[PDB]
Ligand binder design. Sequence first.
Ligand code: JFS
Ligand code: CL
Ligand code: CL
Ligand code: CL
Ligand code: CL
Ligand code: CL
Ligand code: CL
Ligand code: MG
Length: 342
Amino acid sequence: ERPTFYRQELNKTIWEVPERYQNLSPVGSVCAAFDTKTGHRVAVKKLSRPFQSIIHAKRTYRELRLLKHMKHENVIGLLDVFTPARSLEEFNDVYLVTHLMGADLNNIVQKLTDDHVQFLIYQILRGLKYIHSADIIHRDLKPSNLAVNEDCELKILDFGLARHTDDEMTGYVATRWYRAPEIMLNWMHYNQTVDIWSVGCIMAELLTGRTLFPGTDHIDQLKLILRLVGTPGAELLKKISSESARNYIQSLAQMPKMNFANVFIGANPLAVDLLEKMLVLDSDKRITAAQALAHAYFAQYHDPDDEPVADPYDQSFESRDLLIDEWKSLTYDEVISFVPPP
Ligand SMILES: OCc1ccc(-n2cnc3ccccc32)cc1
Ligand SMILES: [Cl-]
Ligand SMILES: [Cl-]
Ligand SMILES: [Cl-]
Ligand SMILES: [Cl-]
Ligand SMILES: [Cl-]
Ligand SMILES: [Cl-]
Ligand SMILES: [Mg+2]
């Protein structure tokens, strides 16, 4: 049976939601609320103009499909999705409900012990093993996209939905400091290995308290990266598809890889070893999430019987060309078929 909905205007917005959600307060637009069915405090997000163009309609479908699939302790999941519409013909608004997140990793990064770093990076890799097993690439791992609570428990959120723009990646900005070099400069078709580069940048910052590669622009950032890991050899150069980018790289004086024990002074030698295996220029040769979970740095948390993988995830829609109203009808079907978690 359809729940009873009620309406209210919150900061120049009309919100129409089921009675179970109470005490809404602004925090798409997002409100915090109390969910009387589950007892949790929740975030309710009303999508802005979800079907205004073909690109926007497909992006709405993409986000709903991804959030419906993610069922893992270290990844954001969907508690509910609803529309006040009674039929496809009046369908216009989409609302998403998740657990309410408080601090991100920035709000926590306090004095962190090596034990804190072990536990935080372990949880990121445990969630990434799950995400990657479904052939999903996050693409935007950075401290503001990692929620952390008082007990140091962590969830990954804000998957890259192919959103970030040119102006957003320009200059002295944290939105670019965690990106792998091959995707920052469009060197090649990238894959899930780009996320492991991001984890290395995050781990380094937890150990030192400082951004690893705070470039003032794309080129300054590339120079910081190559000073640490060395300039590429002929093997990697072959894999860069742009003749232009290859010529630029060969314009630079050659540099050897630095000694990471003299960069991360005083760190656990096992942490230094893991960083050397994540921060490898050739993406083919980086450690994977599944391999990293078995590294000795995580010996006190690793449990191979409690590091689950995902159900298969069908992304064939990504190569499909549809009209606005066909993307809209697919989205409607996914809203009405939602089954809540236990
Ligand atoms: O777009 C999906 C989605 C992403 C993030 C969240 N979210 C959870 N807790 C929050 C607190 C503040 C702002 C957003 C929040 C909800 C939904
Ligand atoms: Cl209700
Ligand atoms: Cl509606
Ligand atoms: Cl898959
Ligand atoms: Cl950030
Ligand atoms: Cl040289
Ligand atoms: Cl699927
Ligand atoms: Mg974010």
